[PDB]
Amino acid sequence: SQYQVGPLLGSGGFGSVYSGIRVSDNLPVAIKHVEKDRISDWGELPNGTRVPMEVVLLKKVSSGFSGVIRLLDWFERPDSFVLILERPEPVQDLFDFITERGALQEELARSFFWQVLEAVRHCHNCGVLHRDIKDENILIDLNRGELKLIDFGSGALLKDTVYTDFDGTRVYSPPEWIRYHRYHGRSAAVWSLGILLYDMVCGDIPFEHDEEIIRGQVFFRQRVSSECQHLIRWCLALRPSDRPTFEEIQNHPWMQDVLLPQETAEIHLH
Numbered sequence: 001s002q003y004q005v006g007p008l009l010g011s012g013g014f015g016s017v018y019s020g021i022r023v024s025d026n027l028p029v030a031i032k033h034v035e036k037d038r039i040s041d042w043g044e045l046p047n048g049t050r051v052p053m054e055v056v057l058l059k060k061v062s063s064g065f066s067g068v069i070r071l072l073d074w075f076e077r078p079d080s081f082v083l084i085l086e087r088p089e090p091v092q093d094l095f096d097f098i099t100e101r102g103a104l105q106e107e108l109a110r111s112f113f114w115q116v117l118e119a120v121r122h123c124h125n126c127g128v129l130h131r132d133i134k135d136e137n138i139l140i141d142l143n144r145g146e147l148k149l150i151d152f153g154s155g156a157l158l159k160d161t162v163y164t165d166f167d168g169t170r171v172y173s174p175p176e177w178i179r180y181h182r183y184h185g186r187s188a189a190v191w192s193l194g195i196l197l198y199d200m201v202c203g204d205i206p207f208e209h210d211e212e213i214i215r216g217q218v219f220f221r222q223r224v225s226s227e228c229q230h231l232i233r234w235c236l237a238l239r240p241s242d243r244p245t246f247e248e249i250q251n252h253p254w255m256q257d258v259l260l261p262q263e264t265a266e267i268h269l270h
Ligand SMILES: COc1ccc2c(c1CN1CCNCC1)O/C(=C\c1c[nH]c3cnccc13)C2=O
Pocket: 009, 010, 011, 012, 017, 029, 030, 032, 069, 085, 086, 087, 088, 091, 093, 136, 137, 139, 150, 151, 152, 153
């Protein structure tokens, strides 16, 4: 009615995502159907309405501009919720991008990683923990060179105490989760960021099995500068408290002289 539904973009047990167009202005959107009986975590709006937590989280971060995909609207159905999400065009997710082009040049990896950090910082500042940071949940606006974080379906309100639930991606999950089913938000995020950064510069993730994660030894399969290797190994410290803060990551020498998004697009995407 209010949207022209296009092709399916992806699906899972959570539900399904379609490309779409808002009739009123031809604005590109994504349409996410979320099955009610597969929602683990429910939240509340002021009005008291139960909604998926993702709706709560998205509202907390969809204020203003950011590298987070914005929730434009949402609807309730008898057995599902429907989320209307911002859709840049043309886009490609980071997983497909790395698949097509292999390991990224460090200058490009630096630009992308920096934008992800800024997006994650925005989330934390808004009281939101994403909990599933990975290449598939990152969209690249190919024209503007801007990255967007998506899928807060595994996320949670940020807190300073321990989390005992996790339904994000295992190979991006920290050793303390694998072992003790316990983690703290920021340090677990930093671990996933380490996995992400390795993924960008090596063209694949560093760990496949639980035992490799808890061993935490990083082998580099591509030529990577010593500074980048150092940042990666720091983010992947076995002890959570040994991991850097976001500020320490962004002040790391490897992170200096980041390209602007449009510069990034001009050199690397055009
Ligand atoms: C299994 O597929 C899923 C699952 C969850 C979400 C999702 C997709 C579809 N793609 C996403 C990219 N990686 C491959 C799978 O998309 C989302 C949000 C979106 C907001 N705006 C957009 C624009 N284009 C595509 C997507 C979205 C989601 O939460």
